[PDB]
Amino acid sequence: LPFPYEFRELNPEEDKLVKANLGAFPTTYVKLGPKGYMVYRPYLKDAANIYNMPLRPTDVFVASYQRSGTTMTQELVWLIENDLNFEAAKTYMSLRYIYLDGFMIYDPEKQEEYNDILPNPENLDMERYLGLLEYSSRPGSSLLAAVPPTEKRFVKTHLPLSLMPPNMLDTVKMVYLARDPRDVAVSSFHHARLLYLLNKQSNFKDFWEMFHRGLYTLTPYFEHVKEAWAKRHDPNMLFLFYEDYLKDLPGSIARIADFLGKKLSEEQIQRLSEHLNFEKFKNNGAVNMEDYREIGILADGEHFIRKGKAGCWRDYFDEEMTKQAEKWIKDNLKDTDLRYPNM
Amino acid sequence: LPFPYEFRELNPEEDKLVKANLGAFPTTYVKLGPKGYMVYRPYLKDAANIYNMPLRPTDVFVASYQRSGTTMTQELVWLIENDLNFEAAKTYMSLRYIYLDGFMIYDPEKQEEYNDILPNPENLDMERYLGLLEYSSRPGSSLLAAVPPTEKRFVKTHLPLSLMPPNMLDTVKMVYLARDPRDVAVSSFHHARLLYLLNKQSNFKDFWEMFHRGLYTLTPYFEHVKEAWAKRHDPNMLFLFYEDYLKDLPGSIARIADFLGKKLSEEQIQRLSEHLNFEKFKNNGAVNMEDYREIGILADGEHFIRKGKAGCWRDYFDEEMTKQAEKWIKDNLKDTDLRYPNM
Ligand SMILES: Nc1ncnc2c1ncn2[C@@H]1O[C@H](COP(=O)(O)O)[C@@H](OP(=O)(O)O)[C@H]1O
Ligand SMILES: Nc1ncnc2c1ncn2[C@@H]1O[C@H](COP(=O)(O)O)[C@@H](OP(=O)(O)O)[C@H]1O
Numbered sequence: 001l002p003f004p005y006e007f008r009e010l011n012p013e014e015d016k017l018v019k020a021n022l023g024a025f026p027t028t029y030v031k032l033g034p035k036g037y038m039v040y041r042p043y044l045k046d047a048a049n050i051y052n053m054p055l056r057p058t059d060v061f062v063a064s065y066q067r068s069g070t071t072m073t074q075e076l077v078w079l080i081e082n083d084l085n086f087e088a089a090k091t092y093m094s095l096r097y098i099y100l101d102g103f104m105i106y107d108p109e110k111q112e113e114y115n116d117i118l119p120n121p122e123n124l125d126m127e128r129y130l131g132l133l134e135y136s137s138r139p140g141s142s143l144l145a146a147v148p149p150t151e152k153r154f155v156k157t158h159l160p161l162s163l164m165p166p167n168m169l170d171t172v173k174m175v176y177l178a179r180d181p182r183d184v185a186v187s188s189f190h191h192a193r194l195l196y197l198l199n200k201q202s203n204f205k206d207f208w209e210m211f212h213r214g215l216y217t218l219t220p221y222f223e224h225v226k227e228a229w230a231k232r233h234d235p236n237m238l239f240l241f242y243e244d245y246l247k248d249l250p251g252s253i254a255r256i257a258d259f260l261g262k263k264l265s266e267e268q269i270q271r272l273s274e275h276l277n278f279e280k281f282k283n284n285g286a287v288n289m290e291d292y293r294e295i296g297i298l299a300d301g302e303h304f305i306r307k308g309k310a311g312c313w314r315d316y317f318d319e320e321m322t323k324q325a326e327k328w329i330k331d332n333l334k335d336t337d338l339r340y341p342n343m
Numbered sequence: 344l345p346f347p348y349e350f351r352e353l354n355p356e357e358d359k360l361v362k363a364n365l366g367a368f369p370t371t372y373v374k375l376g377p378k379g380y381m382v383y384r385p386y387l388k389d390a391a392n393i394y395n396m397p398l399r400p401t402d403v404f405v406a407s408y409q410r411s412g413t414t415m416t417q418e419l420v421w422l423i424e425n426d427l428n429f430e431a432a433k434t435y436m437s438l439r440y441i442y443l444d445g446f447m448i449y450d451p452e453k454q455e456e457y458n459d460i461l462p463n464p465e466n467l468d469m470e471r472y473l474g475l476l477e478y479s480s481r482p483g484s485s486l487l488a489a490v491p492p493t494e495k496r497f498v499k500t501h502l503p504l505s506l507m508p509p510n511m512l513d514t515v516k517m518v519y520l521a522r523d524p525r526d527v528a529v530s531s532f533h534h535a536r537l538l539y540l541l542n543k544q545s546n547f548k549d550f551w552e553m554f555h556r557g558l559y560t561l562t563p564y565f566e567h568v569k570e571a572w573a574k575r576h577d578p579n580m581l582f583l584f585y586e587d588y589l590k591d592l593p594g595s596i597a598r599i600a601d602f603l604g605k606k607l608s609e610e611q612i613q614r615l616s617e618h619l620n621f622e623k624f625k626n627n628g629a630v631n632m633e634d635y636r637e638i639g640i641l642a643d644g645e646h647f648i649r650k651g652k653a654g655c656w657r658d659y660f661d662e663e664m665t666k667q668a669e670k671w672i673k674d675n676l677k678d679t680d681l682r683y684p685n686m
């Protein structure tokens with residue numbers, strides 16, 4: 001099966017906005033497909049392979065537009081499939097899951113350019129840093145095909161459904177997370193600050209400008225959610241809202257367990273929910289990627305697991321931005337049954 | 344005289360490293376003085392008293408950074424002062440010497456927490472175990488003041504000179520032992536394993552990391568040795584190298600005897616050297632503290648008197664560690680006349 005998509009460069013206006021906020025970061029973008037999904041240029045080298053990647057009936061995918069509850073979901077899905085063996089789950093999440101599209105953010109051609117975004121390149125633990133860069137050079141497809149058949153493959157991706165094998169849900173199970181885009185925006189802003197992707201001179205309004213305009217990584221945001229929403233009633237797709245994890249963690253866990261063919265005891269569900277307690281999780285070395293800070297690539301006062309709250313976007317949007325966001329959500333939810341819990 | 348030192352908590356980075364290797368052990372550390380000597384928290388309660396402890400012209404101290412030849416030296420110094428009465432030396436070394444700072448490793452506040460580091464707490468001889476804990480609760484100063492004036496006091500300590508009465512050498516005699524830090528590191532690692540101080544999951548590279556970085560008990564290592572080295576000329580200080588005990592035991596014994604005001608016969612020196620034979624000493628119940636194993640607090644395959652060799656650090660350091668250790672020693676020996684025999 002051939003790759004049915006053409007890519008396109010950003011036009012002058014789009015390129016101006018993006019550069020003004022992300023120009024310092026080495027990697028550039030291109031829009032892919034008819035919906036114009038923003039992908040880091042390096043994604044193109046593995047695009048056809050991903051679209052045609054061989055799937056296995058045992059594969060399990062945790063998909064979502066970034067910062068929507070992926071990490072939490074991965075931990076839950078992993079423990080449940082592995083009979084709540086919390087002990088075995090103490091290994092790095094990055095070793096337990098393959099980040100299908102994680103590679104695209106790195107361009108080997110510009111290797112020398114990446115350390116220049118760091119306040120102090122000199123403090124880097126080079127062995128580990130170069131180690132990271134090498135891993136990031138490996139296309140997702142290869143990482144997946146590498147896993148032996150007698151080992152259950154856990155996949156993490158932020159890729160929209162239209163870029164992966166169509167009908168994939170006929171073979172694999174997927175848990176897709178969606179979150180209020182406004183909160184997603186604030187979390188993505190900080191995430192961007194965490195890894196030095198955003199220009200230090202840019203602020204949140206700038207980021208929000210790129211975001212709702214479909215000029216940030218893997219956006220248009222709504223097209224992304226919509227594809228998954230449409231596959232909501234499929235037996236192998238479990239569409240969940242990040243907000244529900246907060247309002248009723250126990251309840252979400254039951255749904256995930258059932259979706260995976262497991263019946264947990266009220267006690268087991270309780271044990272899992274406690275394990276997912278924000279403070280405890282935020283301090284869980286296996287999932288917070290704090291070891292990245294010892295390597296030297298994380299910014300001061302930023303963490304992968306941040307605040308873990310819903311609705312905090314009100315502390316970042318001014319009157320104008322607020323209305324602009326309302327109109328935007330309004331327009332994209334018009335003539336669809338998609339609705340957010342907290343909205 | 345007031346205690347001229349302030350203490351300081353470990354900063355986040357330092358605390359992370361330490362905890363990762365010693366966290367399971369109940370007792371915590373703090374850095375003391377301008378040099379930042381690592382002391383177990385409980386040391387603070389008796390710090391001022393030790394700094395101001397009353398000394399006696401008959402007192403004799405055997406000092407050193409741990410695992411540098413203290414025990415051997417204690418036996419030699421004791422026999423020589425007691426007219427080679429080998430018979431009277433058959434009593435426990437712990438009863439013949441007061442371990443000035445031995446107490447700091449135990450915190451009565453966490454009494455319940457200590458037995459939890461044992462594989463089998465249930466096998467403990469409780470009477471003796473609680474007996475140990477009680478003795479360990481007594482500050483060193485008190486143990487010393489307790490000894491009657493008509494009895495010669497033998498003191499053992501791993502405290503640097505700057506923490507004891509300044510000018511102390513004006514009253515007491517001290518024999519200070521120094522050993523190649525690399526070998527000291529390997530011996531301290533095993534010692535740490537012996538008493539269950541180190542996390543069972545940590546390995547030697549981890550320990551060596553803490554060690555040369557000044558994050559282990561009574562380090563910075565070089566500052567410790569340097570203080571004693573500077574007083575090497577004083578008539579009441581005898582600076583010796585552990586390595587010399589191996590290359591020329593008879594020769595070291597003569598120096599110790601002369602330092603103490605005793606003239607031994609070539610035969611007496613010979614009798615002493617034989618008494619200090621590694622195998623024989625390692626099996627000497629009065630100094631190997633094997634009775635601690637019957638109590639139940641020693642780890643399998645670990646002993647106080649281990650290999651008794653010099654240079655064996657080469658079997659524990661990999662190429663990188665080796666260079667890192669070379670640079671480190673290089674830097675601390677720069678602009679000083681301090682030199683190690685085997686180096
Ligand atoms: N155990 C947990 N409970 C609640 N929120 C959690 C969590 N672990 C992570 N999060 C939150 O999930 C978001 C990250 O999403 P993802 O894992 O998909 O990248 C962050 O949102 P915030 O930035 O709002 O804090 C993060 O703090
Ligand atoms: N009679 C003896 N001859 C040689 N080395 C001895 C000895 N008695 C003890 N040692 C060694 O001295 C070190 C202990 O030092 P200290 O008494 O100051 O704590 C240990 O080093 P190793 O771990 O290298 O074997 C130990 O085996």
Ligand SMILES: C[C@]12CC[C@@H](O)C[C@@H]1CC[C@@H]1[C@@H]2CC[C@]2(C)C(=O)CC[C@@H]12
Pocket residue numbers: 102103105106114132133136195297
């Ligand atoms: C590219 C970048 C961020 C830019 C540069 O510092 C190199 C690193 C290499 C590791 C990457 C990281 C981005 C976030 C990634 C993709 C992860 O979440 C795991 C691997 C991480």
Ligand SMILES: C[C@]12CC[C@@H](O)C[C@@H]1CC[C@@H]1[C@@H]2CC[C@]2(C)C(=O)CC[C@@H]12
Pocket residue numbers: 445446448449457475476479538640
């Ligand atoms: C604290 C600890 C080790 C931790 C715990 O098992 C209690 C014992 C009590 C006796 C201590 C021992 C450490 C080493 C000591 C200080 C000696 O060398 C003699 C007394 C010993």
Ligand SMILES: [Ca+2]
Pocket residue numbers: 112113114115116
């Ligand atoms: Ca560079």
Ligand SMILES: [Ca+2]
Pocket residue numbers: 455456457458459
């Ligand atoms: Ca206990």
